[PDB]
Amino acid sequence: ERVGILGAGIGGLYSALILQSLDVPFEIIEASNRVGGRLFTHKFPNGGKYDYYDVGAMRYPLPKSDDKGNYQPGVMQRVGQLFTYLGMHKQLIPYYFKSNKSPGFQYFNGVRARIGEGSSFDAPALGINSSLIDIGVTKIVNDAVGPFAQALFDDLQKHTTTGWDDMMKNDAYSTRSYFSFKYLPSPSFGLPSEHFSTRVINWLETFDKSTGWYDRGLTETVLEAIAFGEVGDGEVDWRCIDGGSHVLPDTIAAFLHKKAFVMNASVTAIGLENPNKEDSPMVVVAGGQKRKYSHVISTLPLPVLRTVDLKNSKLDIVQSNALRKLQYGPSIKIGILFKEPWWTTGQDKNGEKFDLVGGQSYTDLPIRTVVYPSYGVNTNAPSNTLIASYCWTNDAERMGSLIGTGAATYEEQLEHLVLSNLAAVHNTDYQYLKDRLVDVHSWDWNHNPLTMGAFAFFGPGDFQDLYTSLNRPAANGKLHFAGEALSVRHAWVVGALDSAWRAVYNYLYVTDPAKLPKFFELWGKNAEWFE
Amino acid sequence: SPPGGERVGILGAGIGGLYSALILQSLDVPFEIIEASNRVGGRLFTHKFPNGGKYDYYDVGAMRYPLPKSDDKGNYQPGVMQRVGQLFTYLGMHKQLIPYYFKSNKSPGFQYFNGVRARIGEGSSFDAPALGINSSLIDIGVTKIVNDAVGPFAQALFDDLQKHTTTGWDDMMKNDAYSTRSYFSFKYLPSPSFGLPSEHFSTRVINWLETFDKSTGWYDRGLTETVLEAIAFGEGEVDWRCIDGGSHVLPDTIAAFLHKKGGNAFVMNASVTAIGLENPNKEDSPMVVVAGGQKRKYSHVISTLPLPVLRTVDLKNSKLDIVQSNALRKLQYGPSIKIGILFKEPWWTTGQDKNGEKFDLVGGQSYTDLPIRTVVYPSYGVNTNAPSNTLIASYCWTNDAERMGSLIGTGAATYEEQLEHLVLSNLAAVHNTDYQYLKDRLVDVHSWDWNHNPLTMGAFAFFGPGDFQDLYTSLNRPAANGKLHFAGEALSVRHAWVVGALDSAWRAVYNYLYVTDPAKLPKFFELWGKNAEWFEQ
Numbered sequence A: 001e002r003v004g005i006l007g008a009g010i011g012g013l014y015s016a017l018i019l020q021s022l023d024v025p026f027e028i029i030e031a032s033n034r035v036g037g038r039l040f041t042h043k044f045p046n047g048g049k050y051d052y053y054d055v056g057a058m059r060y061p062l063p064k065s066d067d068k069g070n071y072q073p074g075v076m077q078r079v080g081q082l083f084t085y086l087g088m089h090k091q092l093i094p095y096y097f098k099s100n101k102s103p104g105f106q107y108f109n110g111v112r113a114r115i116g117e118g119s120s121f122d123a124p125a126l127g128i129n130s131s132l133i134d135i136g137v138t139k140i141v142n143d144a145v146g147p148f149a150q151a152l153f154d155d156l157q158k159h160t161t162t163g164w165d166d167m168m169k170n171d172a173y174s175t176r177s178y179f180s181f182k183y184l185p186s187p188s189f190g191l192p193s194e195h196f197s198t199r200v201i202n203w204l205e206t207f208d209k210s211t212g213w214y215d216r217g218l219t220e221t222v223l224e225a226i227a228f229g230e231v232g233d234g235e236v237d238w239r240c241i242d243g244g245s246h247v248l249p250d251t252i253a254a255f256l257h258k259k260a261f262v263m264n265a266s267v268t269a270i271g272l273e274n275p276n277k278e279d280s281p282m283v284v285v286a287g288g289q290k291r292k293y294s295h296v297i298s299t300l301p302l303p304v305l306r307t308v309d310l311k312n313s314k315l316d317i318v319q320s321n322a323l324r325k326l327q328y329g330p331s332i333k334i335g336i337l338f339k340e341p342w343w344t345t346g347q348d349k350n351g352e353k354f355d356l357v358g359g360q361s362y363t364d365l366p367i368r369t370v371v372y373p374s375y376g377v378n379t380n381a382p383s384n385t386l387i388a389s390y391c392w393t394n395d396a397e398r399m400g401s402l403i404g405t406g407a408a409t410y411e412e413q414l415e416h417l418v419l420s421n422l423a424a425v426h427n428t429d430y431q432y433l434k435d436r437l438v439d440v441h442s443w444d445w446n447h448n449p450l451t452m453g454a455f456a457f458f459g460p461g462d463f464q465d466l467y468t469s470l471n472r473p474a475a476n477g478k479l480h481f482a483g484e485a486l487s488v489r490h491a492w493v494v495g496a497l498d499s500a501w502r503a504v505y506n507y508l509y510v511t512d513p514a515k516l517p518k519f520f521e522l523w524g525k526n527a528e529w530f531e
Numbered sequence B: 001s002p003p004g005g006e007r008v009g010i011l012g013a014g015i016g017g018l019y020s021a022l023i024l025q026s027l028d029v030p031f032e033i034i035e036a037s038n039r040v041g042g043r044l045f046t047h048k049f050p051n052g053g054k055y056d057y058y059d060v061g062a063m064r065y066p067l068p069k070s071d072d073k074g075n076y077q078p079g080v081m082q083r084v085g086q087l088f089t090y091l092g093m094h095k096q097l098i099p100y101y102f103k104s105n106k107s108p109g110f111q112y113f114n115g116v117r118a119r120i121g122e123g124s125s126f127d128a129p130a131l132g133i134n135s136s137l138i139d140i141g142v143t144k145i146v147n148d149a150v151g152p153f154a155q156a157l158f159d160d161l162q163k164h165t166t167t168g169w170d171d172m173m174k175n176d177a178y179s180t181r182s183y184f185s186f187k188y189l190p191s192p193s194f195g196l197p198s199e200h201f202s203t204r205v206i207n208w209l210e211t212f213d214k215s216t217g218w219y220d221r222g223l224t225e226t227v228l229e230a231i232a233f234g235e236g237e238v239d240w241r242c243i244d245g246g247s248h249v250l251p252d253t254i255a256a257f258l259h260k261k262g263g264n265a266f267v268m269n270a271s272v273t274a275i276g277l278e279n280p281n282k283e284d285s286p287m288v289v290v291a292g293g294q295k296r297k298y299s300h301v302i303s304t305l306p307l308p309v310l311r312t313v314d315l316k317n318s319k320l321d322i323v324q325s326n327a328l329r330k331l332q333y334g335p336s337i338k339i340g341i342l343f344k345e346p347w348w349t350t351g352q353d354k355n356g357e358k359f360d361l362v363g364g365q366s367y368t369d370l371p372i373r374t375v376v377y378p379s380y381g382v383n384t385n386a387p388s389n390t391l392i393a394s395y396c397w398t399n400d401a402e403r404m405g406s407l408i409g410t411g412a413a414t415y416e417e418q419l420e421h422l423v424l425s426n427l428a429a430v431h432n433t434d435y436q437y438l439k440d441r442l443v444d445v446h447s448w449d450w451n452h453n454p455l456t457m458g459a460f461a462f463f464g465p466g467d468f469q470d471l472y473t474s475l476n477r478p479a480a481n482g483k484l485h486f487a488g489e490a491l492s493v494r495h496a497w498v499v500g501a502l503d504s505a506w507r508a509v510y511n512y513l514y515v516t517d518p519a520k521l522p523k524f525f526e527l528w529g530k531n532a533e534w535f536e537q
């Protein structure tokens, strides 16, 4: 018995961690020279200890925890338990979703304000009546999303699936089409009992999410609200990893080596050695070499699997459709090393201090979201590194064209655009920021052969029609699909962990069911249902 | 009336900007074209393989034109693409138009779906029963089902063009909040003649429609785009044409036409970074364009820059209203990639598969659910003594192009090799050959991702639901006290077509003449049409 784990991301490392705790031989195959996958920390040369930024995962809305690292039940409990399992609980530092001092900025339609100041951002001129403005985007979206989210939260807490069954009856809706054809405002809002216009819906998307978010599945909007802790009775502890998210996969890998990795070997084929023999082993071609395994746990993204020769893996017609149709979403990040943390110590062109510690600013300008670092803020060498832009959907697609061109002329265009946008958001001059710029690093997860997209971001119908097919194995039960796409926590580490739990669960179920009690004891009776 | 210093700055030497200059030159209106790159044509982009023959090129962007019928003199019947046909005739290119074979001119192209291979027209179900598609839906077929849903909208829009009305568009806009998917999921009911249950299609069935009708993710964009695409494809009959030597001949011929009298020089290699009024408080303020680090002043400006490109330009002092500035961000663009491969021979025309069956393909296309999605065999040069050895091995849209894009333009040999092997493998499975049969014949590969290109920032406009009804009209109004005119194919209902760019230039110039020199309108109408879209009378 020997399990081939494809991909040394967090999902594959977690799978190996489970298999090692159960004394199951395994081997991890990784295409690159690095572990962590979309846990990717870039450290700027010539910078200080905290002059890094996380190009992928950077923030974890964990449940509350005690002094020993025991976490309350919650959406992200499995992530917290993983930290504690690895002895990392005390290495978790606060992540400030909002600024820890003065609030971050909002810059929309040329109107600048602080978060919480109640600006309308010229919405009346956009055709938003005063009643909608008074209610606000947040309350409106909560009224539409809340009912679905509460039912899904009840599923997790009460161990039911009726909430998901109801979500799936509405899975053909995008968030937009739900607002356009189904949602009617709560009578307490005192609004007309009619569906919102596209103008109003686009106003919601502008301040609620990203350009084009609402054209993807309504179910994803509901699941994101649950992941961000906008529903339920428990509160979240926003955390990040001291030194960058890379510490998590590096710590797991070091744990596994003291007891295994095939690096620099990209998988090009997966299939049964002989599809007609019932006891046929799996064959993985990686780095031009054939490797045999009893079972294979794949954590490769779905678009990557579409580049792998899966003949003799005997996918059924639904599984093969799912690999193509289950939708991914894009994302870009731009990190800038400055000479100082001007957002914390500086002032705008009028002498007003920014007074920002951690937190984020938002704008309809191309950069969309600015994320100020929470790590190291209280040390004697605070971070000088800013996430100048963090984009999703259309905003990331458009910005991606200026990233990774390899041409200085477009690198200069990109920097000038980002600094110009930053200047407008914070009310400074361009040169004030240019004089302080040291280095720029940019990344497009939608222009990366190892991800082929930032993460799963399902369109309408994906969850109800195609998602379950990939939780069934292929290759006569010997190929198991895992990775964050195989979860209801897309674009989160916990999604990858859930997928690894289910894949190993199915592996143990068909090969050594006597290990299930210990599996349940160490890693949970269920992937998602709360303890 | 018109000031003596009138001069229109045209931003972008693509087909929209070249057409604008052609109109203005015919009306004796001074202009100047500012272009960021060292080439003209924009998304008319022909790649010539150096080691190949005369017809060893492929069009990375525009390549096929569903024109109306035409007579021997180059007079085109009324139709969606008449404006394109007349442009060809105006430039003396009518006889340089050669057939474009949308379907193969000999044996049909291939379909390869769910591991089942068949020829177009053979009536295969591609294992759809295993997918849960009942026999009634299969017997009807995807094409008839889609036509039943799209037909009513398309017929109303065609009636608009022919009868010179807008009720068809107004009715389309009543449904513009629908994506194609949400329309099928929540509104469409099958025609009683189909004998199907009077219920909305399931997601499984809708995804079956998208699989064979368009591209992965197409149906999540606006229903209106699906309707407008069916109209553009001619669903009067169309004469599919392409341009001998590649689509680059069209913009090259316009540039030569504008240059004949020794003037109308183009400002090349000058990327626009700012557009605005010199003094937004003065009513007579001229426009200022900063391009290549130089300030240039114009009375009016016609922009053909893509909407995502305008979002990288400093538009302070252009005084866009709140709707216009929202439109620049939200009006959605779509992706596309193409992969051209020079082979040693036109094996699709002369070769045979692993079982000895000849492909016998001349022009036309093959389709598959594999990553390459669409294969396009060349129609140009097929009858000459040196036919093309160049294949469009992959032409993708939406999700298929987004995924494939990650393998294009990486700059690393290892990913160039991965890409080639994937493409050849897909091609081998589509045509029923082995990988090595195609590898032995491969000479050179060229790949392009219009969604990773600073000059386009997307392949073309591909609006989401609500874009046409909410934000589209805002950009047909000028900005900058009437002196900034938005043009380019995004400013049309023929997105992803040359005619869209031409329509946008007509409307922009029409608005310029309307506010600056109305005496030129009769000649403008005479030479370039009384309306942008309405059929000629």
Ligand SMILES: Cc1cc2c(cc1C)N(C[C@H](O)[C@H](O)[C@H](O)COP(=O)(O)OP(=O)(O)OC[C@H]1O[C@@H](n3cnc4c(N)ncnc43)[C@H](O)[C@@H]1O)c1[nH]c(=O)[nH]c(=O)c1N2
Pocket: A006, A007, A008, A009, A010, A011, A012, A029, A030, A031, A032, A034, A035, A036, A037, A038, A039, A055, A056, A057, A058, A059, A060, A265, A266, A267, A268, A299, A300, A301, A304, A331, A332, A333, A445, A449, A450, A451, A453, A454, A455, A482, A483, A484, A485, A490, A491, A492, A493, A494, A495, A496
């Ligand atoms: C921009 C951005 C931002 C965030 C996030 C993602 C992104 C892209 N996420 C999500 C989180 O990063 C993600 O869900 C998981 O890291 C995914 O882990 P997997 O193991 O599923 O895949 P992942 O892609 O990480 O790992 C797959 C592995 O397979 C390898 N591989 C690829 N092709 C191969 C081939 N052919 N052969 C062999 N190996 C191959 C890759 O190199 C990689 O090592 C996140 N999460 C969170 O909790 N908090 C957050 O704040 C964020 N934010």
Ligand SMILES: Cc1cc2c(cc1C)N(C[C@H](O)[C@H](O)[C@H](O)COP(=O)(O)OP(=O)(O)OC[C@H]1O[C@@H](n3cnc4c(N)ncnc43)[C@H](O)[C@@H]1O)c1[nH]c(=O)[nH]c(=O)c1N2
Pocket: B011, B012, B013, B014, B015, B016, B017, B034, B035, B036, B037, B039, B040, B041, B042, B043, B044, B060, B061, B062, B063, B064, B065, B270, B271, B272, B273, B304, B305, B306, B309, B336, B337, B338, B450, B454, B455, B456, B459, B460, B487, B488, B489, B490, B495, B496, B497, B498, B499, B500, B501
């Ligand atoms: C892959 C693919 C395939 C097709 C098509 C497109 C694509 C991408 N099309 C659509 C057609 O190609 C397209 O609609 C028009 O060529 C667009 O012409 P525009 O003038 O609107 O823009 P276009 O993008 O062509 O021109 C804009 C110009 O502005 C320049 N520019 C950009 N940024 C600038 C800056 N900052 N400053 C100055 N200049 C700047 C660019 O370099 C370019 O010269 C098509 N159509 C058709 O009829 N038949 C077909 O078969 C196809 N197929």
Ligand SMILES: NC(=O)CC[C@H](N)C(=O)O
Pocket: A059, A224, A227, A490, A491, A492
């Ligand atoms: N849908 C998502 O949650 C994507 C965002 C990502 N999880 C983040 O924390 O930024």
Ligand SMILES: NC(=O)CC[C@H](N)C(=O)O
Pocket: B064, B229, B232, B495, B496, B497
């Ligand atoms: N929507 C579209 O028409 C995109 C396709 C493109 N016009 C072509 O025929 O190649």
